[PDB]
Scaffold this motif. Structure first.
Motif, PDB file in Angstrom:
ATOM      1  N   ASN A   1       2.017   4.568   0.788  1.00 44.51           N
ATOM      2  CA  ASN A   1       1.721   5.447   1.714  1.00 44.51           C
ATOM      3  C   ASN A   1       2.451   6.671   1.599  1.00 44.51           C
ATOM      4  O   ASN A   1       3.542   6.725   2.089  1.00 44.51           O
ATOM      5  CB  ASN A   1       2.033   5.023   3.107  1.00 44.51           C
TER       6      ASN A   1
ATOM      7  N   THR B   1      -0.434  -0.656  13.444  1.00 41.13           N
ATOM      8  CA  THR B   1      -1.178  -0.860  12.268  1.00 41.13           C
ATOM      9  C   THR B   1      -0.964  -0.155  11.134  1.00 41.13           C
ATOM     10  O   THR B   1      -0.505   1.019  11.342  1.00 41.13           O
ATOM     11  CB  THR B   1      -2.536  -1.302  12.849  1.00 41.13           C
ATOM     12  N   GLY B   2      -1.808  -0.604  10.119  1.00 36.43           N
ATOM     13  CA  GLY B   2      -1.366   0.276   8.995  1.00 36.43           C
ATOM     14  C   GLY B   2      -0.086   0.339   8.389  1.00 36.43           C
ATOM     15  O   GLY B   2       0.588  -0.998   8.300  1.00 36.43           O
ATOM     16  N   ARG B   3       0.349   1.345   8.173  1.00 38.66           N
ATOM     17  CA  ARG B   3       1.389   1.679   7.309  1.00 38.66           C
ATOM     18  C   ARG B   3       2.651   1.426   7.789  1.00 38.66           C
ATOM     19  O   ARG B   3       3.845   1.362   7.263  1.00 38.66           O
ATOM     20  CB  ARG B   3       1.353   3.180   6.745  1.00 38.66           C
TER      21      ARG B   3
ATOM     22  N   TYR C   1       0.792  -1.003  -0.119  1.00 40.06           N
ATOM     23  CA  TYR C   1      -0.075  -0.193   0.033  1.00 40.06           C
ATOM     24  C   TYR C   1       0.850   1.109   0.016  1.00 40.06           C
ATOM     25  O   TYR C   1       1.319   1.445   1.027  1.00 40.06           O
ATOM     26  CB  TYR C   1      -0.938   0.147   1.404  1.00 40.06           C
TER      27      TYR C   1
ATOM     28  N   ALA D   1      -3.658  -3.714   1.623  1.00 42.53           N
ATOM     29  CA  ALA D   1      -2.773  -2.932   2.478  1.00 42.53           C
ATOM     30  C   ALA D   1      -2.667  -3.883   3.689  1.00 42.53           C
ATOM     31  O   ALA D   1      -3.616  -4.856   3.944  1.00 42.53           O
ATOM     32  CB  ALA D   1      -3.584  -1.673   2.873  1.00 42.53           C
ATOM     33  N   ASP D   2      -1.473  -3.954   4.459  1.00 39.38           N
ATOM     34  CA  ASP D   2      -0.746  -3.139   4.257  1.00 39.38           C
ATOM     35  C   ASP D   2       0.609  -3.846   3.822  1.00 39.38           C
ATOM     36  O   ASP D   2       1.621  -3.006   3.188  1.00 39.38           O
ATOM     37  CB  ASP D   2      -0.316  -2.392   5.697  1.00 39.38           C
TER      38      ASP D   2
ATOM     39  N   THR E   1      -2.818  -4.577   8.558  1.00 40.33           N
ATOM     40  CA  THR E   1      -3.932  -4.055   7.662  1.00 40.33           C
ATOM     41  C   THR E   1      -4.104  -2.844   8.278  1.00 40.33           C
ATOM     42  O   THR E   1      -3.789  -2.430   9.345  1.00 40.33           O
ATOM     43  CB  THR E   1      -5.072  -5.133   7.548  1.00 40.33           C
ATOM     44  N   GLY E   2      -4.857  -1.867   7.770  1.00 42.34           N
ATOM     45  CA  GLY E   2      -5.375  -0.534   8.156  1.00 42.34           C
ATOM     46  C   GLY E   2      -6.746  -0.376   7.845  1.00 42.34           C
ATOM     47  O   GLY E   2      -7.654  -1.157   8.119  1.00 42.34           O
ATOM     48  N   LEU E   3      -7.019   0.799   7.062  1.00 38.98           N
ATOM     49  CA  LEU E   3      -8.243   1.129   6.673  1.00 38.98           C
ATOM     50  C   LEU E   3      -8.489   0.221   5.350  1.00 38.98           C
ATOM     51  O   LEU E   3      -9.820   0.003   5.086  1.00 38.98           O
ATOM     52  CB  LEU E   3      -8.326   2.643   5.938  1.00 38.98           C
ATOM     53  N   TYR E   4      -7.665  -0.484   4.925  1.00 43.40           N
ATOM     54  CA  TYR E   4      -7.567  -1.306   3.698  1.00 43.40           C
ATOM     55  C   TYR E   4      -6.717  -2.511   4.384  1.00 43.40           C
ATOM     56  O   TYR E   4      -5.950  -2.683   5.145  1.00 43.40           O
ATOM     57  CB  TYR E   4      -7.181  -0.979   2.360  1.00 43.40           C
TER      58      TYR E   4
END
Ligand SMILES: CO[C@@H]1O[C@H](CO)[C@@H](O)[C@@H](O[C@H]2O[C@H](CO)[C@@H](O)[C@H](O)[C@@H]2O)[C@@H]1O
Ligand SMILES: CO[C@@H]1O[C@H](CO)[C@@H](O)[C@@H](O[C@H]2O[C@H](CO)[C@@H](O)[C@H](O)[C@@H]2O)[C@@H]1O
Ligand SMILES: CO[C@@H]1O[C@H](CO)[C@@H](O)[C@H](O[C@H]2O[C@H](CO)[C@@H](O)[C@H](O)[C@@H]2O)[C@@H]1O
Ligand SMILES: CO[C@@H]1O[C@H](CO)[C@@H](O)[C@H](O[C@H]2O[C@H](CO)[C@@H](O)[C@H](O)[C@@H]2O)[C@@H]1O
Ligand SMILES: [Ca+2]
Ligand SMILES: [Ca+2]
Ligand SMILES: [Ca+2]
Ligand SMILES: [Ca+2]
Ligand SMILES: [Mn+2]
Ligand SMILES: [Mn+2]
Ligand SMILES: [Mn+2]
Ligand SMILES: [Mn+2]
Lengths: 234, 234, 234, 234
Positions: C14, C223-225, C12, C204-205, C97-100
């Motif tokens: 970022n 989490t996320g990026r 993903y 993601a991510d 993973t995050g928002l995706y």
């Protein structure tokens, strides 16, 4: 005559030369008539794994043949290979068909030998893919490699049908130092995966991992029950 | 109770608890009273090498202990470790002294386990030097490490002088999945080199390689003839 | 903060924190902001293989990621890890993973670390199947072990579907002695196979192989990026 | 001519052919004139270790040469061996003496090649003791095997004295599959220990680990500065 230690995966019972009347894995020491056998449920057209183990401490030559469903057959024979084998050998894979036949497809082959003393000389090879011109394998008889990445020890027809009266062997190019008097442990292990397929009515004749003198050749006539290993059935 | 499998290099004959009447190697299955032993000439102040091999197919645990002059002792015991150990284990080295003493110095230790099914989980480690802060070893009891690069299983002095009433073990930090019901092959080997030195009236008590439950601790009162292994001599 | 060296398979972009404007492989040296990246075409629902290689001699940390069709991405970064990592570390796999979201499934994972000399200490482990109770892995956050024999770094439903805002890591249980000032060669490699599937609008991510201080835990809000790896995006 | 990739431990500075004016380790790609060199402090009469690393990800051919006191010299050259080397090769060790001379004693040699995935083909051999009749080594020119368990690449006189105008090489018997187009990583590494002693003042000419066409032989006149590797100094 060559000197042969083999682990045979014997698909066809040759009860006139002392096979049990079932397919079987066996330990052969200088005779096609295995010193020890275990009944083997050959799963036609499934990929099998054979592992072979030996070390000079336990002196137990062990083999298992397994398939992914979980069916395994195991055989062992205590045998002092210092007394059987030349110090230097070639290792190889052998197969044959006679009146009946099967594909004797090798999909992978690994071997490790070690000579440990106080603390090692070792050889390890692994093939997961066989190449069309596989320069570190000595191919004998009908044995062919590539481009599908397999080693076909015996003749397979264009249409996929295995042919009878075929024999072929792959031996690793380098001589292997299988025992050495000064070594405190000599060990070897071998693994191969194989695909034995019989469309016709009865698979024959089988696949062997074998260890032999360096100059070992396919004995004349050693198709069929002799597995490309022995000159006769004594 | 912990569950114990071990190869002891037993330097002290406790004939009251079944040792043979000489130094020996022995295969210990859930008991300090070896299932099999072999006479072992321990070479005082010499560096020895122990190689332990277990063959899941052959179901045979074997050990050789050798010294550089070539003198070796060998012991094999036919056993299915599936029926003995739990699935998950720690592997380690153990030594003790009692009323008599010796250095129980480990100069190297290697270990390999493999859990195969068809076409493997494995763990392999090798120590050739032990740091003062050897973070991948659980030291128990009197085990230290460093700074001479060695693992001292039992108390030794400043100037190399062994201590009585000492028990020490080093287990590898990670648990080992030593067998699993669905493993076609569940093999392991281990090798250690050791230096046993004693100016005593007799050396005691021995070094063991061992495999135990994961939470395995030194049993209370397992100095001496119990080798840091066992709660009693049954 | 933890000390982190990683190879990220970052699905993903970022771009606000320095990612290139495409999925990519990266080498992360104490920062989520890769020191080098290569464009990576992540193949959705395919099994990919990452190989990580470092040697102390060439001082170059290299990664390839491939898929069975031949499509590969490569990144190398010139770096002396003696200067970056503590001597003792844990190695592991991380995903987020995050928002995706995406599945971050690990199907296999091996690692080998060697320190020579001047003999060799080494650690090697191999996972081809992950047990439900995989005792030689420290699972962090949402990392499961399987079946499906697999290591699920981030939350997926039993019925395949990946979850958002998920973070999970698996570290090998034993600390690894990854460098030491008196090591001539301090090398390692790792390989892992993975299955990243997403029906999301992007995936993601990503997944990272990482090497961390021994006591490394998931940083708050990584989490996320941040790939479960870093406390911020500096 | 033969195609040669070598790592040279060049003891004798041949400044009329682009050697620096000190003993050096060098990476040679199809020329005796190294692409890259590092100043090397050859420690006369001490046992050195050379480690040689390459993988096809980083494409960095690296070599270190160390002695147990801790001095090491490292050399690396990014080079794409796929474009240099034939697919199948033999690997070996080479040494020479010319007007000046040294023992070029090999005490161990190990080698691993792997082709991964995309699974593995691998060759690994390990020699810690060389045997008088070492059937897996092709000895060329003046290379003997002992015992002593050593490989003498070049002539040593009865009185211990290394002779001038000597060249000898050991190659591993089996061809090695050094690259393969469909492989995701092609790696190799080599290590060897050696003992270079110069009675006579004045060490020459050096030792190389080399990679060559399968039928590679000692080029005529390749004593002295050509290290048994090259037909000329171009
Ligand atoms: C002198 O020999 C000893 O006899 C003692 C009297 O019976 C007895 O306590 C013995 O054992 C101690 O020392 C040995 C050797 O170190 C150990 O094996 C024992 O566990 C105990 O610690 C010894 O036979
Ligand atoms: C719609 O895409 C998102 O934009 C949001 C706008 O601020 C933002 O929350 C973003 O981040 C979340 O999701 C991504 C992808 O999963 C992660 O990289 C982030 O750390 C965050 O969790 C996202 O760009
Ligand atoms: C139908 O069974 C066969 O009887 C034949 C007649 O005597 C006999 O030749 C045949 O042996 C041949 O085929 C075997 C199975 O392939 C093989 O093991 C033999 O070596 C031979 O080729 C079998 O007995
Ligand atoms: C004294 O130095 C030498 O000068 C000589 C002049 O002929 C020359 O032969 C000699 O080279 C020979 O020896 C070198 C050291 O062994 C070797 O590298 C050369 O190939 C050659 O044998 C050196 O230049
Ligand atoms: Ca038969
Ligand atoms: Ca005792
Ligand atoms: Ca990202
Ligand atoms: Ca020179
Ligand atoms: Mn038979
Ligand atoms: Mn005993
Ligand atoms: Mn990134
Ligand atoms: Mn030079």
């Amino acid at each position: 005559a060559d000197t042969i230690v083999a682990v045979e995966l014997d698909t066809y019972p040759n009860t006139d030369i002392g096979d049990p009347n079932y397919p079987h894995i066996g330990i052969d020491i200088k005779s096609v008539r295995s010193k020890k056998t275990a009944k083997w449920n050959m799963q036609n057209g499934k990929v099998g794994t054979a592992h072979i183990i030996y070390n000079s401490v336990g002196k137990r030559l062990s083999a298992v043949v397994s398939y992914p469903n979980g069916d395994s057959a195991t055989v062992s024979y205590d045998v002092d290979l210092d007394n059987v084998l030349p110090e230097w050998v070639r290792v190889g894979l052998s197969a044959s068909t006679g009146l009946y036949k099967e594909t004797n497809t090798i999909l992978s082959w690994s071997f490790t030998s070690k000579l440990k003393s106080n603390s090692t000389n070792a050889l390890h090879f692994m093939f997961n893919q066989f190449s069309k011109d596989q320069k570190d394998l000595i191919l004998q008889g009908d044995a062919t490699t590539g481009t599908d990445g397999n080693l076909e020890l015996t003749r397979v027809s264009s249409n996929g049908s295995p042919q009878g009266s075929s024999v072929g062997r792959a031996l690793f190019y380098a001589p292997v130092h299988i025992w050495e008097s000064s070594a405190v442990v000599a060990s070897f292990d071998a693994t191969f995966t194989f695909l034995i397929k019989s469309p016709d009515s009865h698979p024959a004749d089988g696949i062997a991992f074998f260890i032999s003198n360096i100059d070992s050749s396919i004995p004349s006539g050693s198709t069929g029950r002799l597995l490309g290993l022995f000159p006769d059935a004594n």
